[PDB]
Amino acid sequence: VGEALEYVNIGLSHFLALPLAQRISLIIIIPFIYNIVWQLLYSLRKDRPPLVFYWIPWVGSAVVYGMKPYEFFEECQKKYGDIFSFVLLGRVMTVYLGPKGHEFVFNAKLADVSAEAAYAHLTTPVFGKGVIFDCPNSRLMEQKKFVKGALTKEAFKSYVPLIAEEVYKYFRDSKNFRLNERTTGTIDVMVTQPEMTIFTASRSLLGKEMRAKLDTDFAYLYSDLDKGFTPINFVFPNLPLEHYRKRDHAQKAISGTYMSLIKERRKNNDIQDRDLIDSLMKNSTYKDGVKMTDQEIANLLIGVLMGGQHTSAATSAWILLHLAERPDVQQELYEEQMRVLDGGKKELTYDLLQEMPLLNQTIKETLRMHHPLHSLFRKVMKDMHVPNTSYVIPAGYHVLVSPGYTHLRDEYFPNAHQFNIHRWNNDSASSYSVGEEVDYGFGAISKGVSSPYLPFGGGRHRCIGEHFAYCQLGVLMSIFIRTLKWHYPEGKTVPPPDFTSMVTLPTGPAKIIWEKRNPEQKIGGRH
Ligand SMILES: CC[C@@H](C)n1ncn(-c2ccc(N3CCN(c4ccc(OC[C@H]5CO[C@](Cn6cncn6)(c6ccc(Cl)cc6Cl)O5)cc4)CC3)cc2)c1=O
Ligand code: HEM
């Protein structure tokens, strides 16, 4: 033994004096071997869900998960069942598939999991400090209440003509259309829909001043701010690169613009009930009496606009793309437009939108097939026992829930990969509570989150934008349908989703050909 302890020390010294051909070599093989040995040992544990095997330490299953998450989930599900873990760029993600996974993650106790700890590192640099995920959950809850206060039926009634005006202006003025000059053309929907989305959301939520800014070089700041909203920021949120500083600059410049308007509205006592800015100026005091600062108000405006931007733009792109190979659905939607709007003699209102079930069912079905967020995350803050299992998810893990995956399962939606708006006949609401409700601070929502359809998530982190999204999408698609027919270039069809971007937008270029339904129809107004 004595001799052995000596030769241990000796072996150590001979180890340190290896040629750096082998030292560099051992710098690679040692962690590689430890990783594989650690996994085999991990597999022996019965209080842990199975862990997907991976070859490269730290990286884990990043590539296959990033490129095709639903295919990844399906294969893991076949081998391991509904609960399994995988390593992702240094983190361990525990996936719980299906309605029980929805319950496990969306209805997890506040003490058990943290959304802000999963999300803040990306969003905070983009939006700014003090809001959304850069604050305690209790603060988020009331910010959602504040924002929801501008998103009432009365507001939607006033937004609908504004959104309509923006859509028509876009048809009139955008080079992508120019309907007074051209009767047919080709567009990339991932060019048109982001523009139509920011134009309509700006006009209605932010108001005319902020909409007008988008016709200036100021619009480039939004483009710059947009480039900070990228999944890689979950890993590298701050690097001394240029686009990171353009991001920081844009946030300052845009929030500064919002603050300028806010302070100006207050100076002139010009605070009314037009938009989300008026609403937050009038209603942004927390229940402990602390008021949101003008900066936090501006930051919250940025987050709300950015949130609504990507989910909605991707969704209307998908709607156009699915309908492009379905002239039968376009035809059916057009008949409904003619029926509800008296052949076009009626002006579209929010109330008439609610009487367009097939149009709303079209949005609903598109959100089924294209959940914009394929994976929602929480960081596990306290050890969690998985009910009816021996599994414990330890603090420091992340949990991953994927309702968009269940959207595409035949067991819950027959012929799930078929686009069929009629699967929602007599069920055209954006969603609803099938039972008991609870209020986390921003209104009563469904207590259960077991619905296999969950485009807007559930529990305390549930979306509050769904009715604004349907309003915006509804107005936009109503006008599209009444104005245009469209189809694919020969041999083109619905593109696959890009699962590596922030939302599951279509892989580009995603082009459709439009044609005026009334070649001679003119859009009035000056330009
Ligand atoms: C590196 C190699 C490469 C192959 N790779 N390897 C892995 N990946 C990858 C993995 C995962 C993902 N992502 C996609 C994005 N995703 C995600 C994005 C946003 C998100 O948002 C949830 C929260 C925060 O943002 C919002 C989004 N939102 C909700 N409604 C509207 N937007 C949010 C909520 C509230 C407010 Cl005010 C703003 C915002 Cl933005 O909710 C959650 C997940 C995580 C997985 C992407 C790429 C790769 O690309
Ligand atoms: C089709 C459109 C949209 C879809 C499918 C969608 C989806 C979602 C989902 C799944 C969540 C929960 C995320 C999680 O649990 O981690 C969420 C949260 C949220 N979304 Fe949306 N969203 C949409 C549009 C919007 C719009 C238009 C707005 C604002 C007007 C908005 C603002 C918010 C807010 C404030 C939250 C709460 C975040 C939290 O509490 O952590 N969303 N959304």
Describe the structure in your own words.
With 527 residues, this protein is an alpha+beta fold. The protein has a single domain (46-527), classed as Cytochrome P450 (Cytochrome p450, Orthogonal Bundle), CATH 1.10.630.10. Helix content is 49%, strand content 9%. The protein is built from 19 helices and twelve strands. It has helices at residues 2-16, 20-42, 62-67, 69-80, 99-106, 115-127, 137-149, 153-173, 189-206, 208-213, 219-226, 242-267, 276-282, 294-323, 327-340, 350-353, 357-369, 403-407, 466-483; strands at 83-88, 91-96, 113-114, 184-188, 376-380, 384-385, 392-393, 398-401, 437-439, 444-446, 484-487, 511-516. The protein has a five-stranded mixed sheet, sandwiched between helices. The longest helix is centred in the middle third of the chain and has 30 residues, at 294-323. The PDB classes it as oxidoreductase/oxidoreductase inhibitor. The entry lists the keywords Itraconazole, CYP51, oxidoreductase-oxidoreducatse inhibitor complex, resistance mutation, oxidoreductase-oxidoreductase inhibitor complex. The assembly is monomeric. Saccharomyces cerevisiae CYP51 (Lanosterol 14-alpha demethylase) Y140F mutant complexed with itraconazole.
